[PDB]
Amino acid sequence: GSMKKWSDTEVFEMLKRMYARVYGLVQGVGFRKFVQIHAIRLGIKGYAKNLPDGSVEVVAEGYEEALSKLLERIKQGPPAAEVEKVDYSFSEYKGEFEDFETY
């Protein structure tokens, strides 16, 4: 058996801005709302700026464990619309948004 041991990965401080550019007919339907439920559940900040032009940008902001959860959610469970080409971009946070709301 083992003798040495170590632990790693626990929620502490800071979080990364996940830019998520969602394309397609995701306008109208509760796409940005669905992203809200999980984001809120997992303690994510940002804003879901559904400019009514097919191409809605989201500036969600997550840690690691909470990141992977909110990420794995979206792709796994697509919106109730014809998502055309959801091309997200892992970025970094300039600053934290005051909670997370939808346009």
Swiss-Prot record:
Reactions catalysed according to its record: an acyl phosphate + H2O = a carboxylate + phosphate + H(+)
Keyword set, alphabetical order: Hydrolase
Amino-acid biosynthesis listed as a keyword: no
Thermal dependence: Optimum temperature is 81 degrees Celsius. Thermostable up to 100.8 degrees Celsius. Poorly active at 25 degrees Celsius. Enzymatic activity is increased 4-fold by temperature increase from 25 to 45 degrees Celsius and more than 9-fold at 98 degrees Celsius.
Active-site residue numbers: 32, 50
EC numbers, comma separated: 3.6.1.7
Top enzyme category: hydrolase
Domain annotation Acylphosphatase-like: ranges: 17-103
InterPro entries (alphabetical): Acylphosphatase (IPR020456), Acylphosphatase-like_dom (IPR001792), Acylphosphatase-like_dom_sf (IPR036046), Acylphosphatase_CS (IPR017968)
pH effect on activity, per entry: Optimum pH is 4.7-5.7.
Protein's UniProt keywords contain GTP-binding: no
Single Gene Ontology MF annotation: acylphosphatase activity
Sequence similarity: Belongs to the acylphosphatase family.
NCBIfam families per the UniProt record, alphabetical: PRK14440.1
Protein name per Swiss-Prot or TrEMBL: Acylphosphatase
Annotated organism of origin: Saccharolobus solfataricus (strain ATCC 35092 / DSM 1617 / JCM 11322 / P2)
Name of the gene: acyP
